[PDB]
RNA sequence: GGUCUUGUAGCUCAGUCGGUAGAGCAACGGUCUGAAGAACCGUGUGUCGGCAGUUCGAUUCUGCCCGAGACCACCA
RNA sequence: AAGGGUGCUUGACUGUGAGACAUACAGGUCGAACAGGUGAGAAAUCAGGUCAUAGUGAUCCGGUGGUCCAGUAUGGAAUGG
RNA sequence: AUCAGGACAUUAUCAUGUAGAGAAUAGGUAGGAGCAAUCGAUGCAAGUUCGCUAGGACUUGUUGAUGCGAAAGGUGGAAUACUACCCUUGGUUGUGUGCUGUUCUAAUUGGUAACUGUUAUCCAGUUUCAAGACAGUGUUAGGUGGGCAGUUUGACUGGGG
RNA sequence: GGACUGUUUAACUAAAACACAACUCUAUGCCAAACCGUAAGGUGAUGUAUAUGGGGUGACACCUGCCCAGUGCUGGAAGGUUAAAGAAGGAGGUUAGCGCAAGCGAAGCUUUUAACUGAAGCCCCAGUGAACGGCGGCCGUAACUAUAACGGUCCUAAGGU
RNA sequence: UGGACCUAAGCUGAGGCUGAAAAGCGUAGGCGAUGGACAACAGGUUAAUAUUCCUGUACUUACAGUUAGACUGAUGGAGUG
RNA sequence: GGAGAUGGGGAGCUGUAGCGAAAGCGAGUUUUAAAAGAGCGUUUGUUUGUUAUUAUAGACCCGAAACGGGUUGAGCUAGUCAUGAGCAGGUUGAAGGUUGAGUAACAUCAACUGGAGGACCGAACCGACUCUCGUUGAAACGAUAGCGGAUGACUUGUGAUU
RNA sequence: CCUGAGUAGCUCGGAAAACGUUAUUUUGAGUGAAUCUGCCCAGACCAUUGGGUAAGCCUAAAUACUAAUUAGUGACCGAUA
RNA sequence: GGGUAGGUGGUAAGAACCUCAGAUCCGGAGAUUUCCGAAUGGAGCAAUCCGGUAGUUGGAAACAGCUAUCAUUAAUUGAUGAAUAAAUAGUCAAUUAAAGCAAUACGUGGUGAAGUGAAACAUCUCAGUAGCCACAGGAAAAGAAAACGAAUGUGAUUCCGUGUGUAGUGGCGAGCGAAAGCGGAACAGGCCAAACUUAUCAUUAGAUAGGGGUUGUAGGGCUUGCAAUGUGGACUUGAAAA
């Protein structure tokens, strides 16, 4: 399946290494937040390539994971009730955070931001990991009609 | 057409048995597997492929 | 051809690993009983398929044979 | 006597066999005799299964023993003869 | 991905065992005629296993430096301890080999629903709803399988049967 | 004889035949189950067990007696049979070299089928007859006796109510 | 009578789906009366047709100027048929 | 090369010694210990044409019931979807409801309307059950005579489909 | 330093090679290295030797045939051919 | 262009014409060329119906006349765009190639059985044959050494003849059947990628554009050096000549 990883150490084996063990189909490659580049260029640099942008590309990450951080507790997250007799029905599900981030637009995926699939009335709060260096918190209010 | 669109590698006509005298005549239908498939842009979700070319996709990390 | 299993009394079932041949029915005698019953105690039927070794000492152990029930044999 | 019995050994040998029997063929039958080593019996000679006429199953294919035979370029090996 | 539970190996673990006579539960083979002896014996208490209600073994208490009556004398076809061995049953963890039951989603499956394209029940996508690594499907190898194919089914003969 | 209305070889047979009401069993809880098709696709069906097709019988009324021996079925596991494959281990050969001949022999590879595991089915067992299919002889016995209620035996799973 | 209207199973079929190829399936679309809607009858005459040709009596749907009244209103929804 | 004979063109081809399984030999070879015996040997042409036979090719010749593949077919027949239409005429009176009698009221009864049939009688219409006729005809399925069904599992006009 | 990787191989089926699956060519499933210092081959497979570097591309001749155009020939048939 | 004294295609008699200023006729270049038919604006029963756009002419208009255009796929270009900002499918417009048919013959590839003999037949054969499909061109396929094969030996591929009906193969039958070797027809081998070097791409380029480089007796890359303007077409132009 593959042979590299994204991320160091996190819960198991299979390092952001040129050579890594495998024990069948993994989200170690599948998933977004933890994949592998194409190696394409080992001879004997690509283990000091490696090494460098895991230091250099962890560091951006914790950059870029702050400012998205703030700019998004900064943004306020409202939406409307469509209900009968004071009975909700609105879905409250990865779907909004999805359209906010568009609305903004940076880079994200939908397996990425795990959410609870439910309902919700009145305004309330997540919190949720979006990264391995990561955990923040988003707000969500929604409005009668 | 039993196989995928990147590769071309039609099914072949052979025969079958353990036992007999007599000869007879059945397919190869060659393994297909939808998986999605990896671009920069736009579509990449499933396409029907080979499972050789699956490996060789693992293994020159085509994602 | 191997791979497993099966053999006991006049018939139908037993079987402490080696430390032994035993119920029921087939045939008779007897016991209980006012009588006929009835039921039961039992004379008997036993080299435990056969052949060479094992064991103080073999029906079951070892090897062989005999009577048998099961899964396996085909080039493109 | 080719019957019976006793003793002795084990030719119910090997390499062969002109010459014949009858013969669609294959196949089957009788053996003269030579050479080698033989056993019986002093020798003589016998002894190339049962006194005979019945007692059988073709080839490929496969296995077993030997194999002075070959062995794919070579040596071996495989493998076949 | 995921945890758990049951099997086959065996370390190491202790127990393991009746014909009669045998003071005898005796599985036997042969060197040993020994050693337990502050670590301490014949013999007694409470517990575990056990099988003969009777055999054997272990922790603590106790006997106090002796004897084991099974070292040798002594008995038994088969002698006593230990020594190495082949049998044993049960449990205990040590992992290896594949098995079953788990959870998750993330591959995969949708003849769930919704939305857009699209005036549209097909489709493309996104989500949902689910299942869920089952299972569609592919390959390999078994079974079943006159639904079906190919055919087969000697001869002589007062005709053939 | 069949209930009947009704159907069938245009052109040699129209009915004891077909068919229906109705009866019975059976596979099936939906993407069904049955299938038609090489797969998509489609009916049953914009269907939902009073549904659905198949197997048998064929107004109405009454009965459905015995036998799971074997066959086909349902369920199960004690044990054995078990391909494919996974892989204990062994063997063969070459020979760097050791080497007096021989022979041995590290090295990679070839040939080798194995130790063990290993599915279902099969052998096995419990059930199953408006599912296949079958439903025996003999012997004597009741005050003339031919009669055999009544009893006994060989076979088998069973001896026709 | 039939087209310039639409449909009945059915056919075809951009895309699309499936399948050695051929091809099959199928979305939206498009065809298909023997259906549904629409305004003419009496008579005359050629040897040959005639409701069509000729006499009469009409109607019809569209375009164009026009006068009088008036804001209408579709591929959209509903009845209708 | 006048789409001719030929010239060129040894590449091969028969013989020149054979044996055997071959190794290997050889006027020997195989058996074996053997030279014995047995086995074939102990030089015995070739290139043509012409006949005869033959080898396989549709091969002295015409004869099938078939087989597989590929096409054609629903204007016949059978089945179904749609669209229609017709079925002379006459009988028959199931209910239901209503009136009255009856009864404590029912039950029951006398009736009136009313119209139900895989109803009936039976034309066109369908079918073809029966005898005669022709049966190398008027006619590759009828003609006369009868017969059954004939408001429903009836028929057929057309389209379509298998 | 480079000379073409799910590639040579190998297992399971297979197919063309004279071959009726065996080295040699192809691969449907599975699995899986090396780098001219090596790889493969010389019909199992080792050793020695040789042969050349597959896992890139294209490439006129050497040909089969006459529907045509023209000329021509026929030990070709002469209207049942 | 050539050539001519008549002709008005065949059934030939008549008409009525032109012609000696060059017809008729032959060849070359051509113009035009109804409908349907790959048929393609849309449909349908091929020789049928309805069209749309842009013009243009008539008439108040309606409508009528003469032109081109309007099908699909694929690729490229521009606009375009949903969930969801972007992107994305999709939508339209523009350019370019089809798609057909046949030379009933030859090419390849894919599909793909029987009766047939074997005195049966299920093996082998009939054969990859028939037939079908798809793509072809005047031809195609094939084709430059993991070629051979045993040698002190050859040196892209195809065909022809010997080898030879051999070695083999096989219900070891029917049969099938070479490959080397030799003799001829012709004989041209070249070209990428990969090491390295010049720029763009967020220099994570792994992509593009260019230079070097096209293998056995190893070659190329690398720092250099020596020598040379060469011969070849498999091919671009025009010019001449035949």
Known sequence: ?145 | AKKDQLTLRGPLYGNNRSHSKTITRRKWNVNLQPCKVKTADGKTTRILVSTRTLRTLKKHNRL
């Open chain 1, 1 to 145: 399946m593959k042979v590299i990883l994204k991320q160091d150490v996190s819960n198991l084996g299979k390092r952001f290494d040129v050579v890594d063990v495998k024990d069948g189909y993994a989200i170690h490659f599948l998933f977004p937040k933890k994949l592998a580049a194409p190696l394409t260029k080992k001879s004997l640099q690509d283990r000091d390539l490696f090494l460098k942008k895991q230091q250099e590309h962890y560091e951006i990450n914790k950059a870029l994971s702050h400012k998205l951080k703030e700019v998004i507790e900064q943004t306020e997250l409202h939406f409307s009730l469509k209900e009968h007799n004071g009975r909700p029905y609105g879905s409250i599900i990865t779907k909004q955070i999805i359209n906010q981030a568009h609305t903004k637009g940076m880079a994200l995926q939908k397996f990425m931001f795990k959410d609870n699939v439910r309902l919700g009335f009145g305004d309330h709060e997540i919190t949720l990991h979006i990264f391995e260096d990561t955990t923040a918190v988003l707000k969500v209010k929604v409005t009668p009609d």
